[PDB]
Design a protein around this ligand. Sequence first.
Ligand SMILES: Oc1cc(F)ccc1CNc1ncccc1-c1ccccn1
Lengths: 245, 244
Amino acid sequence: MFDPAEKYKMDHRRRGIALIFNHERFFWHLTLPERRGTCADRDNLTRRFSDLGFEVKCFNDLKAEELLLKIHEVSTVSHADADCFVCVFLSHGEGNHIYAYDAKIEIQTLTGLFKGDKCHSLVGKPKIFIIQAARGNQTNITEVDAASVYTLPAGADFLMCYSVAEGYYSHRETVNGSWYIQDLCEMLGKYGSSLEFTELLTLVNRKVSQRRVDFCKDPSAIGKKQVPCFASMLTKKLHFFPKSN
Amino acid sequence: MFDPAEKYKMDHRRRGIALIFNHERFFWHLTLPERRGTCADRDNLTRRFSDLGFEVKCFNDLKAEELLLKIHEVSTVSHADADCFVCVFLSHGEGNHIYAYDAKIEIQTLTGLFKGDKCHSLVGKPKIFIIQAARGNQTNITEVDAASVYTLPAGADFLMCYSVAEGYYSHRETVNGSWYIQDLCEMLGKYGSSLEFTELLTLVNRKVSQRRVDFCKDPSAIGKKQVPCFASMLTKKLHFFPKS
Ligand SMILES: Oc1cc(F)ccc1CNc1ncccc1-c1ccccn1
């Protein structure tokens, strides 16, 4: 009775929550550059996830204490009547860390809040983390960052989506936002409501990888290709078909 | 005109090569245990990949020099007439490394041989690495290893398939072989020729994660669940439809 086309049950009362932690500026003593264009990423994601039925909650430039407080709140609330959970980090990072305004936080302690034991109401439901984070260097310009955040998985029924893999480069337009987020949001717009979500992330991999880097205004940006990846521990096909209003 | 259902071109003369590096025993001074049951993994993979049209080349207990020589040979040969490339490591590992018989090798130097620049004849073609490697701890029994190998991606058009993620445990039956390889090989057998390959790996994630660990013969094995993962940098849908 094992079914090769089994779908996650996506017929709960609510789609669920999408958190977006948006980080544009950092405490002076961290000496991290501003992420001009991140607000376009935040707004584009808010529209696309909202249109798929998510209750989107955005937070701008939280300090570590506030960020840990919000994400613990969301993890200890009931998801019993929700299909799934989405969490987005738009920041700088290094290895297994993301930067809040004032300090780095271990990604595993954030994903850990939504694992089986700690969040019973999300057991067997998709938990999707999207991470646009790279190394902070030091009218619509393209800024380019080295990959820095480990493309780690997170546990049963987690999907971890990364803007860039080791040895590649992350691009952000200061007005239009991140290449990865622009291409993710275009694909959510056209295909989010019909295509299997990993099939859609594969389109994003193609779109981002096909962006040409041979004729760049800045000569030092030439050859710096971007290739995203995703680490799936999903156990079923994931669709975001339109819900009953 | 951008196509949301675009498939990798899988209509070349040959499917391509599948390498399987099978490591059962290790140099005494490494203090690594034998991997009893790995030969079942090697044989099960050989049958399933052969049935999908791969030219399977197996190597048993190569030392670092021999392993680097074989994999460099395969990387510098023409893949122009091939659909794709598969490479399987059945060994112990730690972090960024896999064990040959005598020493550890950086996984990135092995995958790096098949990247764009270094292997022009595989550009735009799927490069699939399958890694059954965990920490060597010091009739058909179940041995259990802590996850140890980083679940890293490689580059454009690579798919990296891992038996186990951080915090989970890898299981091997000393006769029937690894849980991950048994479930992978069952799914290749039933669905390899019809299903999209990442869809099939998702079935393997479910099969392996549903294997119960509450009533184990060894009490210290209770609660040690196994969850695999894959890191995709594929740009299109990957199918292994029967060739003609
Ligand atoms: O994936 C990236 C991305 C990068 F930007 C730079 C390096 C890597 C590869 N490292 C890993 N990838 C997956 C899981 C764990 C690690 C890891 C953990 C601890 C120490 C080293 N690596």
